[PDB]
Structure 1
Amino acid sequence: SRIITRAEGCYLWDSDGNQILDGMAGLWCVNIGYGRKELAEVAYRQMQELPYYNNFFQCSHPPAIELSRLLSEVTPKHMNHVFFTGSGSDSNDTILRMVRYYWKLLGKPYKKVVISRENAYHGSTVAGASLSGMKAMHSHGDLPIPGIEHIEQPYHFGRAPDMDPAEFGRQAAQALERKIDEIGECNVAAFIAEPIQGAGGVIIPPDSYWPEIKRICAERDILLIVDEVITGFGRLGTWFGSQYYDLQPDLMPIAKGLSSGYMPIGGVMVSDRVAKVVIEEGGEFFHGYTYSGHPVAAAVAAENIRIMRDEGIIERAGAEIAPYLQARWRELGEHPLVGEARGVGMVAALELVKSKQPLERFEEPGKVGSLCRDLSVKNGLVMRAVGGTMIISPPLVLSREQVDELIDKARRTLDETHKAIG
């Protein structure tokens, strides 16, 4: 209902001339901010060079290879292969398809089960929507397809506000060992988790969770799938949310920040463990499946990544602005309407609550965040509402002046929300 005339930097100007700070990077994706001519230029060039090449006819300096090199260099040091695709949901299909195929080639075809988390988002294909724990998506059809289970999420504030933050961290990761010993270790092929859940609020694991979950992936013989669709490309202060939590994923769906949202593209990083098996000594994969991603989108994604490592914008993001934003978000932790002030790197969330000292949640808390979102825009700041959780995922080029806009506009938006409610 807003209608946007101009979009440049971290801003959205609206039809009536109102400047709106985009705290959401649109949809977690535009990391270098808007209005980058350098991406529109490389698109124009590649749409004229060759817009769709097959395997019998490659062009000269094809973008699939320019991109492949940059990503093997920017990604963790064990992941040095990539396969492309048309969005970030496609990525979770290929992972499902190939994680199972890895075990078949290792002689254990019974290993085909894939464990997820409740309130986890992994795509919207028929496989992304089954792996995703959003129980609302599962209504449409008998969606959770065979071989997909789901386990507890580490939402300390919403499940168990009183448990020791770190004892809960250990408990909710052992929820994985529980589901392993009920299904059968030899039936489980892998575990997939966002380093942080975007779509469910900014649900951040206690610092204990990921360590225990890595332990379990060793005692039991299973692959790790980290979904860097959102936490990828500077979103957690680091190139990939894996290196924030010292994970060694055996697969990673990527998208969004790959092209800063300027072009549909997704891919999957493939660790060297699983590459020796499915690529060498394996060609039934890539049968019909063809992973020479759309050349125009890989061309943009290449320039997108050059822009971020050469102008050091994600290195500056994690070193200079991420602290200030996180330190100052906590400041909103004292507003009477706010229960938790959550956040890591360049992403953050607020919990909206009826009273704090007894900490009672609202009956219908979505109606409360749904209002606060409508008043953040009406005060010049985009901020999503999952439930009564307010979230921001700003572009990575944000400047400290633009966080003090964000904080002061948030405080105003909370004060207005707090007056209406009582």
Structure 2
Amino acid sequence: SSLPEKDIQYQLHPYTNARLHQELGPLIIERGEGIYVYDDQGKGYIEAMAGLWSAALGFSNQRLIKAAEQQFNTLPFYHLFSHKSHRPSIELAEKLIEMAPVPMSKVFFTNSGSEANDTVVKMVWYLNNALGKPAKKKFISRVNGYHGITVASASLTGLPGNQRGFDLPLPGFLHVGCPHHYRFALAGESEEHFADRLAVELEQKILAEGPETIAAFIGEPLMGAGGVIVPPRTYWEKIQKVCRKYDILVIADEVICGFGRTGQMFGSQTFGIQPDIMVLSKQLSSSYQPIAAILINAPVFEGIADQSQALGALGHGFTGSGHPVATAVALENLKIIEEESLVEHAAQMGQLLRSGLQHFIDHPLVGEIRGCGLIAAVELVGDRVSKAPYQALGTLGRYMAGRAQEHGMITRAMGDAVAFCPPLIVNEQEVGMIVERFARALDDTTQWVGPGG
């Protein structure tokens, strides 16, 4: 019984067509080193996604591995319930609060981004009950946002693939437009006027729903899984004025943007967001351990704290909340990002990545090249004027990604956009290789389609 046969036999894979998987089986990844991973045939791939937008320090950072060992050999597991605590969680929470781009009060730890956002939802409901506003419960998020996949966080999420078949979203989870100019702007509309229209949409939703019923607005500073969607100029400024106008919390989902991905330490800095709550994960630990953190500002903490007293204790927490190994690894991870000036380095590598891709700006199949910092995407189209896909939506993206993999590079297609989110430690010449392999995949795709013109 071979290893692929066992995988087919025993594992139900996430984000995978189960029947198709029974036919093709897995691609088994055996080992990692630097920005590379190698399959069970010995073939090497540049992991241009950093796994899942996450492996900031790459796939063989010994300092993270040692930090884990040291913590294992001290205290391999403990918890934070009932006043219990431990050093790694305490020092990580300290670090996170002091590096926060706006004044923050407290950290709450979870294992995952989905748990974190699920927890934010509950916290907001608990908060507003504590403040005597029991109607103020609804969340507003965006079409194509991704915020995880619990019953509640999938309701925040605005990708239909996370909702069809699942009876989601739940009631009370509202959606407004995807701020993607290329796709949803009217013909000859400015970024700024698009932003205006989106802010008016949101004010209109709030009034139709009754402002007293709206608790919070949540958004990724720029949307990751939904297509590396950079919001238009002035979006965040104008969306926030609306939120403050009706006393609505602003939650920044920084699970992908956090820790140097967008050219600065947080997407909230890059895009001028003053969030009341931040959600962090992925680069927090370069995914070497599962860990997420929620940062809450003073007003949010004080209301929650009052209620936890009235009710005896805060009735919430995961067994793994603040896990000493995961928190110890994250702490070292963050120190490395500081000590090696990887935010600034990522910004530079991001400029290289983008320039390299921009040699293809006038290619007949390239509709848009977008990104900032060290996150980017190239959205392919069948026709540039109409912006229509070749064959069905997704066809080009799937073909590109398959070619890229053939050429030793792992990228994820989101419809017809192919994404780049490489490790922060990527060096100049590695950026070159990434772009080369993108180009070879585009070439193959171009021969396959035969654009002519």
- Please state if 1:307 is matched with 2:333: no
Separation in structure 1 between the aligned mates of residue 84 and residue 297 of structure 2, nearest angstrom = 26
8 A Cα contact 2:102 2:274, kept in partner: no
User: Which segment drifts farther, 2-11 or 342-351?
Assistant: 2-11
Separation in structure 1 between the aligned mates of residue 267 and residue 415 of structure 2, nearest angstrom = 24
After superposition, what is the alpha-carbon deviation per residue over 1:232-284, rounded to whole angstroms, capped at 9, x for unaligned?
Answer: 11111211111111111111121111110111111111012312322256434
Q: 1:129 to 1:281 in 2, by over 3 A?
A: closer
Superposition TM-score, scaled by structure 1 size:
0.94
Separation in structure 2 between the aligned mates of residue 245 and residue 393 of structure 1, nearest angstrom = 18
Separation in structure 2 between the aligned mates of residue 272 and residue 111 of structure 1, nearest angstrom = 19
Percent of pairs with identical residues:
41
- Please state if 1:89 is matched with 2:118: no
Question: In the alignment, which of 140, 143, 153 is matched to residue 118 of structure 1?
Answer: 143
Q: Provide structure 1 residue ranges, at least 5 long, that are not aligned to the other structure.
A: none
Q: 1:363 to 1:173 in 2, by over 3 A?
A: farther
Q: 1:212 to 1:107 in 2, by over 3 A?
A: same
Classify the secondary structure of the residue corresponding to 1:396: coil
8 A Cα contact 1:255 1:265, kept in partner: yes
For 1:301, give the aligned amino acid: A
Aligned residue in 1 for 2:53 = 28
Classify the secondary structure of the residue corresponding to 1:139: coil
Question: In the alignment, which of 362, 366, 369 is matched to residue 334 of structure 1?
Answer: 362
After TM superposition, give the deviation of residue 396 of structure 1 in Å: 0.8
Question: In the alignment, which of 42, 49, 73 is matched to residue 98 of structure 2?
Answer: 73
For 1:333, give the aligned amino acid: I
Classify the secondary structure of the residue corresponding to 1:257: helix
Separation in structure 1 between the aligned mates of residue 287 and residue 219 of structure 2, nearest angstrom = 22
After TM superposition, give the deviation of residue 220 of structure 1 in Å: 1.5
User: Which segment drifts farther, 153-162 or 372-381?
Assistant: 153-162
After TM superposition, give the deviation of residue 26 of structure 1 in Å: 0.6
8 A Cα contact 2:308 2:314, kept in partner: no
Q: 1:314 to 1:357 in 2, by over 3 A?
A: same
Aligned residue in 2 for 1:42 = 67
Q: In the TM superposition, what are the counterparts of 1:238-317 in structure 2 within 5 Å?
A: 238-279=264-305, 282-283=308-309, 284=311, 287-290=314-317, 292-317=321-346
Aligned-CA RMSD value: 1.9
Classify the secondary structure of the residue corresponding to 1:53: coil
For 1:226, give the aligned amino acid: A
Q: 1:288 to 1:282 in 2, by over 3 A?
A: closer
Separation in structure 1 between the aligned mates of residue 144 and residue 360 of structure 2, nearest angstrom = 25
Question: In the alignment, which of 194, 210, 217 is matched to residue 191 of structure 1?
Answer: 217
Superposition TM-score, scaled by structure 2 size:
0.88
User: Which segment drifts farther, 45-54 or 219-228?
Assistant: 45-54
8 A Cα contact 1:174 1:212, kept in partner: no
User: Which segment drifts farther, 39-48 or 236-245?
Assistant: 39-48
For 1:24, give the aligned amino acid: M
Aligned residue in 2 for 1:321 = 349
Separation in structure 2 between the aligned mates of residue 242 and residue 142 of structure 1, nearest angstrom = 32
Aligned residue in 2 for 1:220 = 246
After TM superposition, give the deviation of residue 161 of structure 1 in Å: 6.5
- Please state if 1:367 is matched with 2:395: yes
